[PDB]
Amino acid sequence: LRPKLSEEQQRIIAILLDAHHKTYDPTYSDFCQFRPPVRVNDGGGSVTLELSQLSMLPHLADLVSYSIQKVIGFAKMIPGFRDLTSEDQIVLLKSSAIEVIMLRSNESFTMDDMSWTCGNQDYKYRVSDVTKAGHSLELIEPLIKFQVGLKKLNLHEEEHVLLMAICIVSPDRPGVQDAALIEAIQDRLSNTLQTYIRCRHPPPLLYAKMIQKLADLRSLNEEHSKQYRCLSFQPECSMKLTPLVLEVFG
Numbered sequence: 001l002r003p004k005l006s007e008e009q010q011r012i013i014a015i016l017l018d019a020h021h022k023t024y025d026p027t028y029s030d031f032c033q034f035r036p037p038v039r040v041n042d043g044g045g046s047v048t049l050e051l052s053q054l055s056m057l058p059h060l061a062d063l064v065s066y067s068i069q070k071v072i073g074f075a076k077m078i079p080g081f082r083d084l085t086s087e088d089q090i091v092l093l094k095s096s097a098i099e100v101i102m103l104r105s106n107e108s109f110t111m112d113d114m115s116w117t118c119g120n121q122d123y124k125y126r127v128s129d130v131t132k133a134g135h136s137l138e139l140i141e142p143l144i145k146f147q148v149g150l151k152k153l154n155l156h157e158e159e160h161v162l163l164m165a166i167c168i169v170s171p172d173r174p175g176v177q178d179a180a181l182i183e184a185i186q187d188r189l190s191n192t193l194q195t196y197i198r199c200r201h202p203p204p205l206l207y208a209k210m211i212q213k214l215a216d217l218r219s220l221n222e223e224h225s226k227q228y229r230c231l232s233f234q235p236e237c238s239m240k241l242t243p244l245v246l247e248v249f250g
């Protein structure tokens with residue numbers, strides 16, 4: 001059975017598409033405002049040297065901080081998000097931050113060379129740049145696998161925006177108070193996505209593959225938090241981060 005998208009569901013898709021267009025800049029025109037990328041010689045992938053310099057940390061912390069501001073902006077426009085208490089809105093935003101960043105970064109990701117290309121060579125990021133910000137292979141290698149797997153789903157913008165919205169509005173986050181309200185908003189989004197796939201995505205299991213990407217994001221989020229914990233033990237690391245990054249990941 002292929003039920004047609006309701007007027008409410010079409011409205012939700014239009015709102016989410018407009019939300020994304022207002023919060024995502026595909027020209028990466030603000031990148032020159034971040035602290036500059038610094039790429040020291042590190043062919044060996046030396047942990048000692050990486051922690052000593054953290055050369056890419058001010059630039060990547062600014063990029064993530066910027067991306068979180070856009071995610072906050074996006075989330076505010078999700079149908080129903082504003083019906084939640086401000087305590088739940090912040091729990092949802094904090095717990096999902098790195099996952100939604102991983103999803104939205106897929107738009108700039110390219111399988112041509114397995115990089116995140118955000119304009120010129122200065123804003124072209126690879127595995128070696130994430131290690132230069134103090135992260136390790138236990139995070140970057142499944143992260144690249146996730147980017148390729150997600151890129152290969154060839155999501156329509158409609159599916160991409162619904163996936164981000166479903167990620168954010170998740171009832172199974174620690175500290176939520178009204179799980180039932182969060183679940184009702186998420187189901188409204190999940191049903192819109194299933195119906196959209198069935199009636200708009202041409203052949204050649206896409207909904208189940210998208211839900212699997214959400215479970216993959218959970219493991220990546222746990223690895224990132226463990227790595228952020230280690231990176232934060234580096235003396236004077238806080239000056240290389242941002243107040244927003246410190247609060248979200250602290």
Ligand SMILES: CCC(CC)(c1ccc(/C=C/C(O)(C(F)(F)F)C(F)(F)F)c(C)c1)c1ccc(OC[C@@H](O)CCC(=O)O)c(C)c1
Nearest residue numbers: 023024060061063064067070101102104105116125133245
């Ligand atoms: C460079 C690769 C990557 C990939 C997800 C990234 C970058 C940083 C970090 C960690 C950083 C940290 O742990 C710190 F401490 F190492 F900095 C912390 F999370 F704490 F910040 C990780 C783990 C991965 C990245 C690439 C492009 C990105 O965006 C392109 C476009 O989406 C932007 C405009 C918009 O989203 O509206 C973003 C947002 C991130």
